[PDB]
From a paper:
The CSN6ΔC structure encompasses the typical MPN domain fold composed of a central β-sheet made of seven strands decorated by three α-helices and a small anti-parallel β-sheet in the Ins-1 region. The MPN core is extended by a C-terminal appendix (residues 192 to 208) that includes a small helical portion (α4 201 to 207). The asymmetric unit contains one CSN6ΔC molecule, but the crystallographic 2-fold symmetry operator generates an α-helix swapping-stabilised dimer, involving the C-terminal α4 helices. The same comparison of the monomeric form of human CSN6ΔC with human Rpn8ΔC and Drosophila CSN6ΔC gave rmsd values of 1.64 Å for 153 Cα pairs and 1.35 Å for 84 Cα pairs, respectively. Although not unambiguous, these NMR restraints were useful in combination with sequence conservation pattern and crystal packing information to delineate a CSN6ΔC surface potentially impacted by the addition of CSN5ΔC. The CSN6ΔC surface engaged in the binding to CSN5ΔC most likely corresponds to the region comprised between the α1/α2 helices, as delineated in Figure 2B with dotted grey line. Indeed the functional significance of this particular surface is strengthened by the facts that: (i) it is a highly conserved surface among CSN6 family members and (ii) it corresponds to the homodimer interface found in human CSN6ΔC and Rpn8ΔC crystal structures, as well as to the heterodimer interface found in budding yeast Rpn11ΔC/Rpn8ΔC. To further validate this interaction surface, we mutated two CSN6ΔC residues, H44 to an alanine and V115 to a glutamic acid, chosen for their high conservation and their positions on the putative interaction surface, and determined the effect of these mutations on the association with CSN5ΔC by ITC and activity measurements. The H44A variant showed a slight reduction in heterodimerisation compared with the WT control, whereas the V115E variant showed a significant 5-fold reduction in binding. Using this pro-Nedd8 gel shift assay, we showed that the hydrolytic activity of the CSN5ΔC,R106T/CSN6ΔC,H44A or V115E variant complexes was entirely compromised.
Residue numbers in the entry: 38 to 208
């Protein structure tokens, strides 16, 4: 149980990653990355994200750890006060592939957040969901599942040039 505030930039970044990869590959593809921000007590503020490299090995998605560590290192050289908080991907509801990848991310951080963005909604006006993992037992054995969390959009400073300011210009 945590409270989660999401900065608009995170949502825009993830959609951007998906749009750019779809253009590059000529088809929609799943994209994966890191969530960055701050946590104080049970309160998590998700401030930014960045793309991560993965490889498909024996038909499974493997996060490139060496890529991640270099990427994190460079990010922290600039943003000294921010921390890795979890990971994101795109698609529908959480699935067994997400579970397999989440277990890798659990090797980087204790209790990573998981954010999924659905790039194929036409109806929902914020196709983003956030999860934490839980280990449930029902017929003998530990089973990792995702529990969905409520989130809010993070309050931003008056001097920030944010989504409202820029949206006034686009249309």
């Amino acid at each position: 149980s945590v409270s989660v505030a999401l900065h608009p930039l995170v949502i825009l970044n993830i959609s951007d990653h998906w749009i750019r990869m779809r253009s590059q590959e000529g088809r929609p593809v799943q994209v994966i990355g890191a969530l960055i921000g701050k946590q104080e007590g049970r309160n998590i503020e998700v401030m930014n994200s960045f793309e991560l490299l993965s490889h498909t090995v024996e038909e499974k998605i493997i996060i490139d750890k060496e890529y991640y560590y270099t990427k994190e290192e460079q990010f922290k050289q600039v943003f000294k006060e921010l921390e890795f908080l979890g990971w994101y991907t795109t698609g529908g509801p959480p699935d067994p592939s997400d579970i397999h990848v989440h277990k890798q991310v659990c090797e980087i951080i204790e209790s990573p957040l998981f954010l999924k963005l659905n790039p194929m909604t036409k109806h929902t006006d914020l196709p983003v969901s956030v999860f934490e993992s839980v280990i449930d037992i029902i017929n003998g054995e530990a089973t990792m599942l995702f529990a969905e969390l409520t989130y809010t959009l993070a309050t931003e400073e008056a001097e920030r040039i944010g989504v409202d300011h820029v949206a006034r210009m686009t249309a």
